[model samples]
Target: EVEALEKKVEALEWKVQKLEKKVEALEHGWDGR
Candidate 1:
């Protein structure tokens, strides 16, 4: 259960990073990746 929770947190953080990157790209009017 502990390992599963850690994995879930990692996935959430990864998603947040992607979301922030997309927002940053939109603000700059360009695709960063």
Candidate 2:
């Protein structure tokens, strides 16, 4: 049960990181353009 919870946490963290990366890219993209 603990392991399953950890997996869920990891997945959530991964998604958060992915979203952060996308937002960062969008925020910086105008500089490049």
Candidate 3:
């Protein structure tokens, strides 16, 4: 059960990082032209 919780946290962290990157890109006007 502890391992499963750890895995879930890791997945959440990964998603958060992805979302942060997306927000950063938008703020920097990274529209891919």
Candidate 4:
């Protein structure tokens, strides 16, 4: 059960990294408008 929770946390962290990259890109002013 602990391993499963760890895996879930890792997945969530991966998603957060992806989102952070997207946010940084947008902040850099490339919103594609």
Best by TM-score: 4
Model 4: worst 10 consecutive residues (lDDT sum): 24-33
Please tell me which model should have the higher lDDT, number 2 or number 3: 3
Model 1 lDDT per residue over 1-33, tens place:
999999999999999999998899999989553
For candidate 4, report its TM-score: 0.76
Model 1 Cα shift for residue 26 (angstroms): 0.7
- Record all residue pairs in model 1 with backbone atoms less than 3 Å apart, i.e. clashing: none
lDDT of 3 at 14: 100
lDDT of 2 by residue, 1-33 (tens): 999999999999999999998889888894562
Candidate 2, residue 7: how far the Cα is off, in Å: 0.4
Return the TM-score for each candidate structure: 0.70, 0.68, 0.75, 0.76
Model 2: lDDT of residue 32: 69
The parts of candidate 2 lying over 4 Å away from their true place are 30-33
Per-residue lDDT of 1-33 in model 3, one digit per residue for the tens? 999999999999999999999999988879771
Lowest summed lDDT window (length 10), candidate 3:
24-33
In the range 1-33, model 4's lDDT, one tens digit per residue, is 999999999999999999998998888877672
For TM-score, candidate 2 versus 4, the one ahead is: 4
Worst 10 residues of 2 by lDDT: 24-33
Best-performing candidate as measured by lDDT: 3
Please list the C-alpha lDDT of all candidates, in the order they appear: 0.93, 0.91, 0.94, 0.92
Off by over 4 Å in 3: none
